[PDB]
Amino acid sequence: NSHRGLAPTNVDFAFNLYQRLVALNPDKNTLISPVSISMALAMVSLGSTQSLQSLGFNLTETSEAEIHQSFQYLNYLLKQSDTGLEMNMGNAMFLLQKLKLKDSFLADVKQYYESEALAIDFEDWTKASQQINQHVKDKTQGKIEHVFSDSPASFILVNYIFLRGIWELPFSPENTREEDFYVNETSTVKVPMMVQSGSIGYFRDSVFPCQLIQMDYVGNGTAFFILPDQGQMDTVIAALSRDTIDRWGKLMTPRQVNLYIPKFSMSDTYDLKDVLEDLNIKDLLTNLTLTMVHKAMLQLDEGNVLLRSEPLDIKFNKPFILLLFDKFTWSSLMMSQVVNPA
Ligand SMILES: C[C@]12CCC(=O)C=C1CC[C@@H]1[C@@H]2[C@@H](O)C[C@@]2(C)[C@H]1CC[C@]2(O)C(=O)CO
């Protein structure tokens, strides 16, 4: 069970953060990777107790070494569901001005996490931001092309994750066709809609009015597509917890379905300074300003590697919730509110 030792903490943290973010802006697409955010905060706590406490740990019960060792081990366990998941995750620190990180900190970070520190010598912010942008692109297989544009900091942390998976039940690109997606009450937009028929894990819940489709990736990855009943998005969002997802996971059963899911890439940024407030940058530097951002990017596509029951049609053609998890570590790989895939 040790491979799952951080799940309860990490996943409580993930659902609370997600709910907070959806509340702050309910009308936007939200995409984050909680496990990636947990890693980034844990990593910065190497050089800074209020960071770790904010992640959900009580340090009277778990020592510092225990946490960093658990996170190290988790990072190794995560890079293994990659049989059917392209998952470029990492942390880059960019140091502007004449600033150097402590040798102690830089070493601890390389060791327990896989982070990188780069000196940006351009005073001009346009160049600086571009170099920072070229970095993260290269590290994400050409996929995250911009992070900044935007207020220049002296010390910049980028936590990034590109994710893209191969389905156990892939869609046929031939079947993908333009359909209406209903964004809100007045506006429809056209999106490429993927379509397949088959026996697919499905649940129609009543306490929280939604329908769920569970789509497995090849490997240990899995996706919950959650379609709230009409008018019920706020309710379902409030339902989200480790308690609730445990229930759902146990009630999913194969059912013959006609399944319509949009093909899209989504990306989003999250200011880590609202979970990691009042860091002392001087604790990290050998001896001004601070930008710490998490950028997540999900490519959702057809995902291919190479009965006398009437099927039910379920279309994700209006806003929905997308939760990606690792079945092995119980990690939250991504949580999303998909409001508009066009
Ligand atoms: C709440 C739960 C169990 C207790 C825990 O500390 C953390 C979690 C979060 C992730 C959950 C997990 C289990 O319920 C099994 C789940 C649902 C997993 C995500 C995907 C899962 O592995 C399955 O889909 C199993 O079919």
XYZ file of N, CA and C in Angstrom, residues 177-184 186-194 260-263 315-320 339-342:
93
model
N -16.557 13.872 -36.448
C -17.251 14.848 -37.278
C -17.712 16.070 -36.497
N -17.844 17.176 -37.224
C -18.250 18.445 -36.648
C -19.669 18.354 -36.116
N -19.832 18.682 -34.839
C -21.143 18.802 -34.228
C -21.198 20.064 -33.385
N -22.423 20.450 -33.035
C -22.679 21.527 -32.089
C -22.246 21.172 -30.670
N -21.608 22.123 -30.007
C -21.392 22.021 -28.581
C -22.107 23.201 -27.937
N -22.894 22.935 -26.900
C -23.678 23.973 -26.241
C -22.954 24.583 -25.037
N -22.270 25.700 -25.279
C -21.397 26.341 -24.278
C -22.174 26.913 -23.107
N -23.213 27.660 -23.418
C -24.073 28.244 -22.409
C -25.515 28.250 -22.906
N -27.172 30.646 -24.636
C -27.391 31.338 -25.907
C -26.459 30.847 -27.016
N -25.271 30.372 -26.643
C -24.207 30.137 -27.608
C -23.908 28.635 -27.850
N -23.963 28.242 -29.127
C -23.407 26.972 -29.576
C -22.214 27.272 -30.487
N -21.242 26.367 -30.466
C -20.010 26.468 -31.236
C -19.842 25.093 -31.871
N -19.088 25.028 -32.955
C -18.785 23.759 -33.619
C -17.508 23.159 -33.017
N -17.519 21.860 -32.703
C -16.329 21.125 -32.234
C -16.188 19.788 -32.989
N -14.946 19.308 -33.208
C -14.826 17.947 -33.736
C -15.274 16.953 -32.689
N -16.307 16.183 -33.017
C -16.874 15.213 -32.102
C -16.477 13.805 -32.520
N -15.784 13.136 -31.605
C -15.354 11.748 -31.772
C -16.518 10.850 -31.428
N -20.091 9.995 -27.581
C -19.702 11.186 -28.306
C -18.882 12.103 -27.390
N -17.604 12.274 -27.710
C -16.698 13.067 -26.891
C -15.955 14.018 -27.814
N -15.819 15.300 -27.428
C -15.086 16.200 -28.321
C -13.567 15.953 -28.354
N -12.967 16.164 -29.516
C -11.524 16.173 -29.684
C -11.044 17.610 -29.486
N -23.834 12.070 -25.104
C -23.005 13.074 -25.751
C -22.486 14.086 -24.744
N -21.172 14.273 -24.757
C -20.516 15.326 -23.994
C -20.475 16.532 -24.904
N -21.665 17.082 -25.144
C -21.861 18.180 -26.090
C -22.303 19.488 -25.382
N -22.075 19.504 -24.066
C -22.315 20.641 -23.180
C -21.285 20.567 -22.045
N -21.123 21.652 -21.253
C -20.025 21.584 -20.284
C -19.983 20.339 -19.404
N -18.772 19.828 -19.199
C -18.576 18.632 -18.417
C -17.330 18.693 -17.538
N -15.695 23.771 -20.563
C -16.830 24.662 -20.796
C -16.963 24.923 -22.288
N -15.836 24.897 -22.981
C -15.784 25.251 -24.368
C -14.558 24.608 -25.026
N -14.740 23.478 -25.760
C -13.637 22.835 -26.485
C -13.310 23.335 -27.882
N -14.035 24.324 -28.407
C -13.753 24.877 -29.756
C -12.431 25.613 -29.862
